[PDB]
Design a protein around this motif. Structure first.
Motif, PDB file in Angstrom:
ATOM      1  N   UNK A 130       0.805  -1.227   0.000  1.00  9.29           N
ATOM      2  CA  UNK A 130       0.000   0.000   0.000  1.00  9.29           C
ATOM      3  C   UNK A 130       0.842   1.282   0.000  1.00  9.29           C
ATOM      4  N   UNK A 131       2.166   1.144  -0.027  1.00  5.67           N
ATOM      5  CA  UNK A 131       3.062   2.266   0.257  1.00  5.67           C
ATOM      6  C   UNK A 131       4.154   2.421  -0.806  1.00  5.67           C
ATOM      7  N   UNK A 132       4.599   3.653  -1.010  1.00  7.34           N
ATOM      8  CA  UNK A 132       5.721   3.934  -1.899  1.00  7.34           C
ATOM      9  C   UNK A 132       6.413   5.190  -1.401  1.00  7.34           C
ATOM     10  N   UNK A 133       7.713   5.292  -1.636  1.00 10.56           N
ATOM     11  CA  UNK A 133       8.425   6.476  -1.217  1.00 10.56           C
ATOM     12  C   UNK A 133       9.803   6.490  -1.823  1.00 10.56           C
ATOM     13  N   UNK A 134      10.600   7.467  -1.405  1.00 11.37           N
ATOM     14  CA  UNK A 134      11.951   7.618  -1.915  1.00 11.37           C
ATOM     15  C   UNK A 134      12.940   7.894  -0.785  1.00 11.37           C
ATOM     16  N   UNK A 135      14.090   7.227  -0.822  1.00  9.40           N
ATOM     17  CA  UNK A 135      15.190   7.513   0.097  1.00  9.40           C
ATOM     18  C   UNK A 135      16.348   8.160  -0.681  1.00  9.40           C
ATOM     19  N   UNK A 136      16.514   9.468  -0.503  1.00 10.37           N
ATOM     20  CA  UNK A 136      17.511  10.250  -1.233  1.00 10.37           C
ATOM     21  C   UNK A 136      18.952   9.796  -0.951  1.00 10.37           C
ATOM     22  N   UNK A 137      19.260   9.555   0.320  1.00 11.29           N
ATOM     23  CA  UNK A 137      20.590   9.101   0.715  1.00 11.29           C
ATOM     24  C   UNK A 137      20.979   7.772   0.072  1.00 11.29           C
ATOM     25  N   UNK A 138      20.018   6.860  -0.049  1.00 11.35           N
ATOM     26  CA  UNK A 138      20.250   5.574  -0.706  1.00 11.35           C
ATOM     27  C   UNK A 138      20.030   5.677  -2.211  1.00 11.35           C
ATOM     28  N   UNK A 139      19.397   6.772  -2.631  1.00 11.65           N
ATOM     29  CA  UNK A 139      19.039   6.998  -4.031  1.00 11.65           C
ATOM     30  C   UNK A 139      18.100   5.916  -4.574  1.00 11.65           C
ATOM     31  N   UNK A 140      17.072   5.567  -3.805  1.00  9.10           N
ATOM     32  CA  UNK A 140      16.129   4.545  -4.260  1.00  9.10           C
ATOM     33  C   UNK A 140      14.682   4.984  -4.159  1.00  9.10           C
ATOM     34  N   UNK A 141      13.898   4.546  -5.137  1.00 11.32           N
ATOM     35  CA  UNK A 141      12.461   4.626  -5.066  1.00 11.32           C
ATOM     36  C   UNK A 141      11.968   3.209  -4.780  1.00 11.32           C
TER      37      UNK A 141
END
Length: 166
Positions: A76-87
């Motif tokens: 049910x969820x999605x997001x982005x981690x800038x430090x890891x550079x992942x969606x």
């Protein structure tokens, strides 16, 4: 014998993997980051590292001792981690069984944040829409994988699987 690059993971049923890549193509331009191939989409339970054939066996035997009922995952969820550079794709309240499984496999060998990575090298912030509808399914097993690098692409080779009970 030779040391391999190993990890335990939960896989996704084929229909859902296809739904996920259609959705990804719809909401993320190729510029947003490097897309994970459909067959390479997975949820990592524990990253092990380079592993001697010796300690591969000891991890394989102890994964064999795990006694855990199956559980349902609903993405049910999605997001982005800038430090890891992942969606990534995720579950807001993941079931207890998933956490217990990941923790047992992290112990037999930063806290566990279960996720399925969709794009790599996503250095820029981008808009994250919610996941598509009804990506929900029963987890019946988990797998020990080896990751190689073949013809430029990343390749995951299944070594062993263990049924979860239900």
């Amino acid at each position: 014998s030779e040391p391999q690059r190993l990890f335990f993971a939960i896989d996704l049923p084929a229909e859902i993997r296809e739904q996920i890549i259609h959705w990804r193509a719809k909401h993320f331009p190729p510029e947003a980051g490097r897309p994970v191939a459909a067959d390479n989409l997975h949820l990592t339970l524990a990253f092990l590292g380079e592993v001697s054939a010796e300690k591969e066996k000891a991890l394989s035997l102890l994964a064999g001792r795990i006694r855990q009922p199956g559980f349902t995952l609903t993405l049910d969820d999605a997001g982005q981690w800038l430090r890891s550079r992942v969606v990534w794709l995720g579950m807001r309240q993941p079931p207890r069984g998933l956490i217990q499984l990941a923790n047992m496999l992290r112990s037999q060998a930063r806290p566990f944040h279960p996720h399925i990575t969709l794009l790599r090298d996503a250095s820029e912030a981008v808009t994250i829409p919610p996941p598509g509808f009804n990506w929900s399914y029963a987890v019946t097993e988990f797998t020990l994988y080896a990751s190689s690098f073949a013809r430029g692409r990343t390749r995951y080779t299944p070594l062993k699987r263990w049924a979860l009970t239900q």
